[PDB]
């Protein structure tokens, strides 16, 4: 799981 | 699972 | 499952 | 599945 | 299943 | 682009 | 780009 | 990108 | 950029 | 970048 939020 | 949220 | 959301 | 969504 | 949506 | 092998 | 190898 | 190989 | 080798 | 081998 890979998660990238901004 | 990949997520690329902004 | 990819998801790419902007 | 993939989501490319804007 | 993909999803290209705008 | 999506690419999917079986 | 998403790559799938079954 | 994402990359899955089985 | 996400790599799983199966 | 993640990396990920079985």
Not at 1 to 6: A, C, R, T
């Amino acid at each position: 799981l890979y998660i990238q939020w901004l």
